[PDB]
Write a protein that binds this ligand. Sequence first.
Ligand SMILES: CCC(=O)SCC[N+](C)(C)C
Length: 285
Amino acid sequence: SPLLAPVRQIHAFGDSYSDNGESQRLTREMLAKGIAGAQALPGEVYWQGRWSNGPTAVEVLARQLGAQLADHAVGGAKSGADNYYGWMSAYRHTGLAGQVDAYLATLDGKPVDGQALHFIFVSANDFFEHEDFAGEQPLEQLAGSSVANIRAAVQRLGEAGARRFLVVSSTDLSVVPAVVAGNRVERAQRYLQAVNASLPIQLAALRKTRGLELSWFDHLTFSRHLRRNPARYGLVELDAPCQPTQPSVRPACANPDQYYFWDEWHPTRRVHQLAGEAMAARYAR
Ligand SMILES: CCC(=O)SCC[N+](C)(C)C
């Protein structure tokens, strides 16, 4: 199958797996304004506003493709309007649907770039918020909502003029250290299988109806290759965070590039690099 056409501009939408500074900017604005419950995100033990110790995967992807990046993703973002952090809603809707809305409002009349790649990577916070705040919805129904929400984002961007998309699957929530510690490995498996079975069917139907260029990145296949043969990728430690934060911050491991996880939820820069390189692989430079 032929490589897809080159990419010169990316518009990225999603959560802390893509965020390159928005949760930092937004939370300082929320702190300055006095919004109740606001905290400085991501925190002290993170690199330059990323929720990791280096560039996120979409930033690597942009580098790999020779593209410029406008990264609208916000740490904590859910697939609908709002954030894992409920207190942000008093200031901005920073979920995927919020990000789409702000991107389209910020065009200032001008058209959508029909050549820009619209990059969508979200859903983990749907599961985390459900599990952390005792959500009552069955997981299959939550998965349904996540899927609807993502499809609706692509439909809305398409309606406004976007033509090119890369949508990332659920990551393997089942091996995230926070999920292991919460004894929630089976819930994560069931959730991520339901999103990843359904989403690509919905996206294929939309891609055909609206004549889109839509690529699907299966992040679970990707992390299964990394975790089955880690020495091949220079990785040694697959389960412990390099930078513990929970219950409290402790000293970082000395060899973070041999680690899969930076904190209890987020991958290291080395995993982000590998993912961004893999994501670039269906596109011509
Ligand atoms: C995990 C994908 C994200 O955006 S991190 C946001 C906050 N949390 C406590 C790690 C869920």
